[PDB]
Structure 1
Amino acid sequence: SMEQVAMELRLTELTRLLRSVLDQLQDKDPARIFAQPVSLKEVPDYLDHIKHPMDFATMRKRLEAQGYKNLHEFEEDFDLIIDNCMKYNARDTVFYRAAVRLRDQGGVVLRQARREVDSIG
Structure 2
Amino acid sequence: SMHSDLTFCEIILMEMESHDAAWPFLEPVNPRLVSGYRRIIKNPMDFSTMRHRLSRGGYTSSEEFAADALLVFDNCQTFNEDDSEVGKAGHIMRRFFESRWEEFY
Shared fold by TM > 0.5? Answer: yes
TMscore range, shorter length? 0.7 to 0.9
- In the alignment of these two chains, the number of paired residues is 105
For 2:55, the aligned partner's letter is E
CA 1:33–1:17: 2 relative to 1, 3 Å? same
Gaps of 5+ in 1: 1-7, 115-121
Structure 1 residues 29, 68: closer, same or farther in 2, change over 3 A?
farther
Where do 1:5-44 residues align within 5 Å? 12-30=3-21, 32-44=23-35
**Does structure 1 residue 104 correspond to structure 2 residue 95?**
yes
Structure 2 equivalent of residue 73 of structure 1: 64
Q: Secondary structure at the match of 2:58?
A: coil
Letter in 2 for 1:97: K
Amino acid across the alignment from 1:79: L
What's the CA shift for 1:102? 0.8
**Which has the higher mean CA deviation after the structures are superposed, 49-58 or 32-41?**
32-41
> What SS does structure 1 have at the residue aligned with 2:32?
coil
Closer, same or farther: CA 70–29 of 1 in aligned 2, 3 Å: farther
Alpha-carbon distance between aligned partners in 1 of 2:24 and 2:45, rounded to the nearest angstrom: 12
Query: Residue 81 of structure 2 aligns to a residue in which SS?
Result: coil
Shift of 1:29: 4.1
TM-score by length of 2: 0.87
Structure 2 unmatched ranges of 5 or more? none
Which runs of structure 2 are paired with 1:80-119 in the superposition (5 Å)?
80-114=71-105
Larger-Rg structure: 1
Runs of 4+ in 1 over 6 A off after TM superposition: none
User: Are the structure 2 counterparts of residues 29 and 58 from structure 1 closer, same or farther at C-alpha, using a change threshold of 3 Å?
Assistant: farther
Q: Could you tell me how far 1:49 is from its partner in structure 2?
A: 0.5
Q: Tell me the CA shift for residue 20 of structure 1.
A: 1.1
RMSD: 1.9
